[PDB]
Structure formats: C-alpha cells, structure tokens
Amino acid sequence: EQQIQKARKSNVSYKNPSLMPKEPHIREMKIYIDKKYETVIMPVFGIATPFHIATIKNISMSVEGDYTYLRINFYCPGSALGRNEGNIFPNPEATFVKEITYRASNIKAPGEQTVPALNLQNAFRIIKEVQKRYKTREAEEKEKEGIVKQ
Amino acid sequence: MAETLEFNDVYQEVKGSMNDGRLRLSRQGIIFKNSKTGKVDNIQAGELTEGIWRRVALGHGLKLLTKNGHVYKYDGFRESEFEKLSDFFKTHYRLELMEKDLCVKGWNWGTVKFGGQLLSFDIGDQPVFEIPLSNVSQCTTGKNEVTLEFHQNDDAEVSLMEVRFYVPPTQEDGVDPVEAFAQNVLSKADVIDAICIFRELQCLTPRGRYDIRIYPTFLHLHGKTFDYKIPYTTVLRLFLLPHKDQRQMFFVISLDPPIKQGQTRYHFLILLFSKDEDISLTLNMNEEEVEKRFEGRLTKNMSGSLYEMVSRVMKALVNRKITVPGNFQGHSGAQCITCSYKASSGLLYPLERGFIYVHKPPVHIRFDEISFVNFARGTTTTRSFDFEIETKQGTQYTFSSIEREEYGKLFDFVNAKKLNIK
16 A cells, blocks of 8 residues: 655754854854754864764863863764664765864963853753753654554 | 955964964965964965855864865954955955854764864764864774874863764674774874773673773773873772682772872772783883883783783782682682672682771771671571671771671681680
C-alpha cells in the first residue's frame, strides 16, 4: 500500500551577511552569542566566524589559575553518537571542525573593567542556555509532529 | 580623483591581536604604519593582484593578495570606504576591489584550501574562516583528526588556543589524508612540549577513555569532551594495586585539591590496566636532558607493561614512592577483600600503612587515623562480617558483606597491626 515521507533541512544562522549583528563584543573580538537567531560568533584571527548552536555538540570550561580554557566541540562523522546518529551530514566527506579551544587570562588588567576569563565564563553560560532552549524546542517540535488531534 | 589618499582609523590584526595604525594609498603603492609595533608595511603598485572587501569583526576589512603569493589584511574601515578604494584601484592600480563576505550560514563543515602561510575554511564559494598557518606552534594528528596548537600573545584577551579538524578517509589519495593535511600544514608553518603522551587509558574515576600528556610540572588529562590539568604539587600518593582475579592492575592517584567538575569533586584518579597490555614509549627529550632531569631514572626509549610504564613515569616525576600491597593475602589468594560500601560493591586493600577502598566512591584511611575497629557479625554465621572502621575524627566507615575466611584472616592481620578492636 501507499507510504508516507517527510522532508527536512539543516539550520542556518543568517541567510545573508546583512542579517549579521553589530555588537561591541564582536568588534572587540569577544565570543558573542545571538539568542534571537541562536548563533555563536567566535574570533578567528580578526574574523568573527559564526556557528549555529546546532553545530556545537557540547562545551567545556577549565580554570588553570593563570589561564582559563574554553573548549567547544561540534558534530562530525564519528562524533555523532547517541540519538543524533540519524542526523546524517549532507556530505560526510567534507572537513568538519571538531574542536576549538580559547584561552583567557584570569589576571585583572591594571585597574581595567572586566577580566578576560569572565568573558569566557559568561559565554559558556549563555551558550549552555541557548543550547538548552534550542534542544527543548527541537524536542517539542519533533514530538508534536505525528500526533493525532483529539 | 586625487593621486593620494589617507586613512587614520585603520587597524591591523597580528596573531589574533588587534593593532591600530595609519594607511595611505598613492601611485607609488600602499603604505601602512602600525602603532603598537611601530612597523611600516609597503605594497608597491605593481604587486597587487586581488582585492577583496568583507565585513570583518572590527568594522569592515580589505584583503590584498599580491604577485608574491602573500596576502595583506587591513581592518577598521567603514562601508563607504569600499567605493573610494575600488575607484582608486581601478584608476591607478588597474584593479577593482570586489566584495566577498564570509559564509554567514553558520555551518561547521566545508572545504579546506592551502595558500602560502594561510589556511582557508570555506563552503562552496563563500569562505567560513581563515587560519594563518605561520601562527601554529604545533601540529598533531590522530584517527581522521588533525589538531593545531598556536602560540599566545599577551595583548590578546581571548586567544585561540587549540583547533581540531576531523579529516575523513580518502583512499583515492593513496596516502592517509590526515598525513597529507599534516604535511600541507608543516610546509607552510614554522613549528618549534609534552614529555610523553599515553592515548586512551581506561579510567574508572572519572569514567571513560582519556589520553594523558605529561609535562614537567603537571599532567593534562584530555577527554573527548571534558579536560583537566593536575599539577604534580597536588598529588599526594600513588597506589598500584592488583585485581582480585589477578588479571588487572589499579593505578590510583590521590589528589589535593580534588579536580572539580560542575557539582562533583574527585579525590582520586583511578586507572585500570591489563597485565597483557604492553607498550613502547619514546620521550620527547634527549638522553643528556633526561639524565639531568630524571637523574637516570628514565631513558630516551622504554618498553614494558603499560601499568609498569605509567608507574615508573609517575614515580620519576613526583618522587613519591608508589604504595604497594602489604603482607596481606586473603583466603582466596587475592590481595584484597570484596566488600560493600555506600550501596556499592568494591575491593578493599590493606596497604602497608592504611586501607584503601576502590573504586566506586573510593576511600583511604591510614592506620594512624583509625580510632578503633569493630568486627560486627550480621545475621548469618557465615559470610556476614562487617568490618566497620571509626576514625579519630569521628567518621565511621562501614564495609559490610565479607566472607568468613576473609574475616578470620583480617582478624589476624589487624591483630598483627595492633589496632583498637572494640
């Protein structure tokens, strides 16, 4: 007999550069997170590179007294373990950025405002919150798709 | 148009650190002057070949690729300076500054391209990001993975420490694509480290596979997600214990302060090895340097059991002697007793000067810290000897479920050690 099949599409942070944000954090090359668009923009040698929260697999943060390390791991072939296996990448033969680590000094500059590691900590917290919200919404949508209206 | 133009709000990125300076365009060429470094960069009019304009972090940005295969970059411009730059280049340099923003779709996948001392991660036609290979302080490889470790500038508040790329297999290239990527990176970078790197070691607390990098003053426990760094100053004791079945070895490291992970603190680092798991290690040092550092305790190249290698390395590093099982031998011939504790089964080892319970929530109690002991007898008259231990601080540890013969042997052992038996 007949069958049923649905479609899907990957996530996009900004469909065009015109939709890119303009924030002092981005200007100063600080790990920015846009919540309305659910994107994380990170500095890559003067290049504010964005990544959708979906690309990130998880994040970790460590403090080493003198410096603080913030690691960000994305999804890629081999690393798509768990309930994400079905999320087959559109081109598994391409190059996947699997890990990016940033380092911020914990020493407060002479009478300056904030500490560099404070920025990394804030970024970690905001990314965790955005990932929680994104995963919650995705789970809600996935469980609503296919319900018989009563 | 005029034959000369000047700009005072120009910046320059150097190893992740922003630098201000002035810029001037003329028929002679393009001259930039950095302020922090005081350097003067010059690009003759006959060298330019390609001019790209793209919104960078600090405002907009110009990218000039010259005949010499070198690409200069400038930042701090406005959206209106693009017209002036393009008109000047077309009127004097025969070139047209074209716009080419980076990929803003936010995808962690794409293609990689090499060109001079700069790597470019792109997607189709729009680039995603660029990485100057000259700034790489080290390049390591793995299984379908390449890792680049960069240097560090003091002015860079948020410095890019380490990056990793998953390189899938491509048998069509004959050579491993990982090795090919590493060679392409080395051909452009200027690599200058860890003493020895053990890859994938069965850990019980924390759980999972973790690689261990050795450093002169600490050890880096790298995981697939979480990472830790334990200075040798934080280590207290090293314990090497056998398994009950005489087939595995427990390597325990007592930490202080305990490594923290969110809402949990680990007081011991437990590792599990197999006696039939050999290894052959080679240090990242020279013979004389090793002789000066470890005083001959180690050599440039070693081989032997994995647990033996780890024990030797940690001993030569920390100077603390590795505790080993005492003169205790249970009825089953094992060097421990299987007992329960805090709703979890495990192994209790009578060390030479204390007890250590592993591995689930591990515990360690030295003889001097014990106030007294009690051989409580449970319900049955067989295999029901709870070996409770109360310390002088007031903490009482209950190790229940012990065989009768194990209890008889522990009784003789405690009577030999002379402890307060209540």
